[PDB]
Amino acid sequence: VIEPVYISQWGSMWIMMRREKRDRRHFKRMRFPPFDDEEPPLDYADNILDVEPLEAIQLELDPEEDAPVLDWFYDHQPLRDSRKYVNGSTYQRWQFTLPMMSTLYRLANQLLTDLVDDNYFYLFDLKAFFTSKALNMAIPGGPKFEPLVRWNEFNDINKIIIRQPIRTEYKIAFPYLYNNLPHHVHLTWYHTPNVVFIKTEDPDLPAFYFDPLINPISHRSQEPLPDDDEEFELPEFVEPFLKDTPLYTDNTANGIALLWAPRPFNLRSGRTRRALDIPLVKNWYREHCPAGQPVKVRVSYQKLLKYYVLNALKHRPPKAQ
Amino acid sequence: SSKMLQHIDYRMRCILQDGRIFIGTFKAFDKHMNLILCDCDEFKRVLGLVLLRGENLVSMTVEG
Amino acid sequence: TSVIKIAVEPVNPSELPKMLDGLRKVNKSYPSLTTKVEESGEHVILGTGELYLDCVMHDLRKMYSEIDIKVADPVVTFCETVVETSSLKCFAETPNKKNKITMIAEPLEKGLAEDIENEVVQITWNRKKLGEFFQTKYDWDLLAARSIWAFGPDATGPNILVDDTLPSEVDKALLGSVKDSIVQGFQWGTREGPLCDELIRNVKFKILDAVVAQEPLHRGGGQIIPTARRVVYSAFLMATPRLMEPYYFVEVQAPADCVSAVYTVLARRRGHVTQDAPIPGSPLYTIKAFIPAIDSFGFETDLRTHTQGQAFSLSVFHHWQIVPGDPLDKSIVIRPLEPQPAPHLAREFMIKTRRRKGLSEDVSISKF
Amino acid sequence: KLVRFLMKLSHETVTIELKNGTQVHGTITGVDVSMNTHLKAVKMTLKNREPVQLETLSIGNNIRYFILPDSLPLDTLL
Amino acid sequence: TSLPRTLDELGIHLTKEELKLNIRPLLRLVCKKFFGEFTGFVDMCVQHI
Amino acid sequence: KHAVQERLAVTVCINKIDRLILELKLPPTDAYYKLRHIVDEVNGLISMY
Amino acid sequence: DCLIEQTHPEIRKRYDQDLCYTDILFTEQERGVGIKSTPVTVVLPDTKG
Amino acid sequence: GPLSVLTQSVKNNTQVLINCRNNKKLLGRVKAFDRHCNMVLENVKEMWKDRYISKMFLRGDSVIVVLR
RNA sequence: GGUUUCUCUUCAGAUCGCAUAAAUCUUUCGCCUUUUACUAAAGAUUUCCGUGGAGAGGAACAAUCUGAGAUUUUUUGAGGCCUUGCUUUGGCAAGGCU
């Protein structure tokens, strides 16, 4: 399956199951087992092949707003026929157009995150979790593990001044500075430059527009200028390169937003993946815990992240075979 | 054609197609290396403000 | 300035020379690194910042030594200044009891310490040029300006050796003969420092009397310099000195929502905002602030933890300020692990520094 | 091509032999697009006469031959 | 739509697989082919350093 | 400040100009104003150091 | 890295990652920050070649 | 064009003799030519006596004829 | 100077896999009458579901397509001509020449 198509399809499915519990007055739960122990396996031709299937979930798509994905969004093979999009019937590599990624990126807003950089994951990253397991201290929001390993005059009270506590975050961030015997420690990334990305609401605003959320410049000694129109008037047929080209399109800001779209949504071409091989809600537990949570979902976050760190740690480069 | 700014104040000596070499203060020049050199003395006479063309100036040097 | 101080120690005393070879390797490979061995056998490293020193210790633990080496707590280093003048016209004399030197230590002015440290004024100038510098903008007397002999613990350090002696101007040829040895005694005294072995700064050392025998010779051949050191130490003792703490300047690129949270972490770490402004042409804010260097240990880490890494701070050594506590109050109770309050801070700082390498106690009449 | 190679090697010492026989050998100050180029410390030997050491000599296409130094590889301008 | 039109307006010829690339390395290649090599920095550090 | 003390010829390149464009979406007049203010503050800092 | 991509013909930056040519210690790659300064000697052409 | 490229290839593979208009018959490797016949010759002995010049640049007005 | 697709062979050294399981063994544990079945950490290997590059064969559709291919400044007439030195006979080393 193609990853943004599959993700936007499941975001739509999420929207209609939200609608179905929010709109159905009385849901009826299903019997288990659906057949009795005396009920035999029925014949497909006698029961199912001769009858018509009922309706699937299948939201109506906008002819105006969901225009490129309007036809093939609910196919098992959406664009396998189209040679301009895929290689053919193997359904291996997809090569696409910007407005359908804009439409799918708009449609998949429920499952997708809103973060723009890894600076949100300051010490909540995989290198920090490897450091936390290898040195056997943990964040209260972070998962816990087994100990990996299982008099000093530096511990003299008359040579130690205590002003601020040297907590977990400090020893994680500077392990050679703070943790004696640092073994198998994975150093974290430092501060990337912060993404300050303007997000537009309406296409009425231009793609080169001063956002009032940006603080104003308030800019405040002469310039080395030549003689004004006394020498070097420009000749005939000299012009800016794209003077004939217009300034911006409505899909220009869509492509600007698609640049800061996440990893399955900032791509024009790629390979299709197995739907077992695509983890859809990985971002939902790869973020922090939200507010108002009970104990059980935070333990759920910690255990899911714990096995995610274990799977990331036990990755090996595969052999030839 | 581009040596006028280096000798816009200093004196230069250039040899014309006649073989006469004149040293004088180049005050102005044209785009085809036709340099008007004021107070030009040819090696002995005086040519005044002499516009020596680029094809005429086979050899030249900075005298002043 | 390499101001952060860390003690370091190998687990194995058999592998103690190997980490010493690695210490020469990291001191060779790093320009601003300072490696020292104290009287207690401890190895004190002075560095710029915590990330820099963690990189140095990582290089030592991985490449330059294969030995696992214990690391103590990071602290800072201080200087020594004074508040009031020396209340006694205090003296010492040579081991051959002929040359008697009397001198007092007093606080310096505001811009003089940073001017000498930035070499705005030099001893390489003319004495009249130095007097014009001290008389135009610092409004000194010309006699006090021509009385200036030497600057601080090193080349152009922030102590001013004023030699204005009308009782000893009757033998000013002998005074100029012993002037150089007085200069090395003053340089050695301000280099060592008798409080907790820190460098002496912002002190004007005014000489009052010099009862020196004519042509000391045998007692002038290496005895004036410890006599002048005793004079500097003894004049520093009753001059009510204070410890002198470096401060750190912090510049913060922050989103505008968590500004009160940054203020809360500043209240937690005793920091005060110089100025907060929005960035011109950017929606974020820049916060300029000042913090104690002791409280600056991972203020960036705590701020990124509180602001989820959105607020990013960078700090530098900026300047020095006095510690508000008193170092020489023997009546101050000090707990060895509880964080002391602000009047008890400097007392704890001098006790632990004196316990770190030498004798813990301090005597105000140890020399004189 | 050759003008680009002269502009690239217009700092080294070369000899420019004019059509009048004046051979100016010295360091190149700057090579223009045309043959009028400025040289530095050129010992301009005259036609069957002595040399004159000119610190600034600007050349018209009278300069015919150009004996270039060895500061030019085969793929330096290729 | 108008990217090969812009390419011909800049006088740049590119293949179809370069137009089928993702946006950031394609934009890096477009800016590299537009500005050539780095020469303003060379003039910056020769004429003024 | 250290270049003023070390007395070396300093030229300035303005990097990451795409953050004004793709990431900030500035008007060309406002981007020119920001760059001119950057040049003005660098010139003022050179004046006062 | 852009100057190395200009000069060295076979050395190109990958699409996913930004390479760091001067950062040659492994600690710089681990931390994701420049640590130790690096000299490079190269032949560079200007606009005039 | 193609004839100049063939003459440059013959000069690279052999000793080409170019007799310029300044009476300079140079036998050697002509490194490059031009559209204005700005010819650069690498290690060519020119007779004005075949004195060897390591790199000689000549103009098309000052050149007359070439040969392989 | 086709494409799609299928099969086989070969190299898989890239996150071969923007995914992730299991097994054995060497051990530490948790549990603990004992046997599998156990708990979670490490080391040592493996297996499975996938994967990339190359080549061959086959099939169906393009059936070509796709490439490659002047006078007027400074890059062409200021062109001719003579004597002495040398003729080294293509004219050369010096002078007055238009």
UniProtKB/Swiss-Prot annotation, chain A:
Expression (tissue specificity): Widely expressed.
Compartment(s) of residence: Nucleus; Nucleus speckle
Signal peptide: none
Top-rank taxon, per record: Eukaryota
Subunit and partners: Part of the U5 snRNP complex. Component of the U4/U6-U5 tri-snRNP complex composed of the U4, U6 and U5 snRNAs and at least PRPF3, PRPF4, PRPF6, PRPF8, PRPF31, SNRNP200, TXNL4A, SNRNP40, DDX23, CD2BP2, PPIH, SNU13, EFTUD2, SART1 and USP39. Component of the U5.U4atac/U6atac snRNP complexes in U12-dependent spliceosomes. Within the minor spliceosome, which acts on U12-type introns, interacts with PPIL2 and RBM48. Core component of U2-type precatalytic, catalytic and postcatalytic spliceosomal complexes. Found in a mRNA splicing-dependent exon junction complex (EJC) with SRRM1.
Role summary: Plays a role in pre-mRNA splicing as core component of precatalytic, catalytic and postcatalytic spliceosomal complexes, both of the predominant U2-type spliceosome and the minor U12-type spliceosome. Functions as a scaffold that mediates the ordered assembly of spliceosomal proteins and snRNAs. Required for the assembly of the U4/U6-U5 tri-snRNP complex, a building block of the spliceosome. Functions as a scaffold that positions spliceosomal U2, U5 and U6 snRNAs at splice sites on pre-mRNA substrates, so that splicing can occur. Interacts with both the 5' and the 3' splice site.
Organism, scientific name: Homo sapiens (Human)
Swiss-Prot record, chain B:
Superkingdom, taxonomy of origin: Eukaryota
All residue ranges annotated as the Sm domain in the record: 1-64
Cellular localization per UniProt: Cytoplasm, Cytosol; Nucleus
PTMs per UniProt: Methylated by PRMT5.
Disease field: Cerebrocostomandibular syndrome: A syndrome characterized by severe micrognathia, rib defects ranging from a few dorsal rib segments to complete absence of ossification, and intellectual disability.
Subunit text: Core component of the spliceosomal U1, U2, U4 and U5 small nuclear ribonucleoproteins (snRNPs), the building blocks of the spliceosome. Most spliceosomal snRNPs contain a common set of Sm proteins, SNRPB, SNRPD1, SNRPD2, SNRPD3, SNRPE, SNRPF and SNRPG that assemble in a heptameric protein ring on the Sm site of the small nuclear RNA to form the core snRNP. Component of the U1 snRNP. The U1 snRNP is composed of the U1 snRNA and the 7 core Sm proteins SNRPB, SNRPD1, SNRPD2, SNRPD3, SNRPE, SNRPF and SNRPG, and at least three U1 snRNP-specific proteins SNRNP70/U1-70K, SNRPA/U1-A and SNRPC/U1-C.
Misc remark: Patients with the autoimmune disease systemic lupus erythematosus (SLE) have autoantibodies directed against some of the individual snRNP polypeptides. The most common autoantigen is called Sm. B/b' bear Sm epitopes.
Family designation: Belongs to the snRNP SmB/SmN family.
Name of this protein: Small nuclear ribonucleoprotein-associated proteins B and B'
UniProt organism field: Homo sapiens (Human)
Residues shown, of full length: 6 to 84 of 240
From Swiss-Prot, chain D:
Keyword annotations of the record: Cytoplasm, Isopeptide bond, Methylation, mRNA processing, mRNA splicing, Nucleus, Repeat, Ribonucleoprotein, Spliceosome, Ubl conjugation
Subcellular location: Cytoplasm, Cytosol; Nucleus
Domain Sm: 1-72
Signal sequence region: none
UniProt key word Transmembrane: no
Region of interest called Sufficient for interaction with CLNS1A, as start-end residue ranges on this chain: 1-78
Disulphide bridges: none
GO molecular function, one term: U1 snRNP binding
GO annotation terms (biological process): 7-methylguanosine cap hypermethylation; mRNA splicing, via spliceosome; RNA splicing; spliceosomal complex assembly; spliceosomal snRNP assembly; U2-type prespliceosome assembly
Superkingdom of origin: Eukaryota
GO cellular component: catalytic step 2 spliceosome; commitment complex; cytosol; methylosome; nucleoplasm; nucleus; pICln-Sm protein complex; precatalytic spliceosome
Reported modifications of this chain: Methylated on arginine residues by PRMT5 and PRMT7; probable asymmetric dimethylation which is required for assembly and biogenesis of snRNPs.
Miscellaneous note of the record: In the autoimmune disease systemic lupus erythematosus, antinuclear antibodies are developed with Sm specificity.
Family: Belongs to the snRNP core protein family.
Record protein name field: Small nuclear ribonucleoprotein Sm D1
Annotated organism of origin: Homo sapiens (Human)
Parent-protein residues present: 2 to 80 of 119
UniProtKB/Swiss-Prot annotation, chain F:
Annotated signal sequence range: none
UniProt-annotated binding residues for GTP: 15-18
Superkingdom in the source lineage: Eukaryota
Cysteine disulfide partners in this protein: none
UniProt family annotation: Belongs to the TRAFAC class translation factor GTPase superfamily. Classic translation factor GTPase family. EF-G/EF-2 subfamily.
Disease: Mandibulofacial dysostosis with microcephaly: A rare syndrome characterized by progressive microcephaly, midface and malar hypoplasia, micrognathia, microtia, dysplastic ears, preauricular skin tags, significant developmental delay, and speech delay. Many patients have major sequelae, including choanal atresia that results in respiratory difficulties, conductive hearing loss, and cleft palate.
Subunit structure: Component of the U5 snRNP and the U4/U6-U5 tri-snRNP complex, a building block of the spliceosome. The U4/U6-U5 tri-snRNP complex is composed of the U4, U6 and U5 snRNAs and at least PRPF3, PRPF4, PRPF6, PRPF8, PRPF31, SNRNP200, TXNL4A, SNRNP40, DDX23, CD2BP2, PPIH, SNU13, EFTUD2, SART1 and USP39. Component of the pre-catalytic, catalytic and post-catalytic spliceosome complexes. Component of the minor spliceosome, which splices U12-type introns. Within this complex, interacts with CRIPT. Interacts with ERBB4 and PRPF8. Interacts with PIH1D1.
The name this protein goes by in its record: 116 kDa U5 small nuclear ribonucleoprotein component
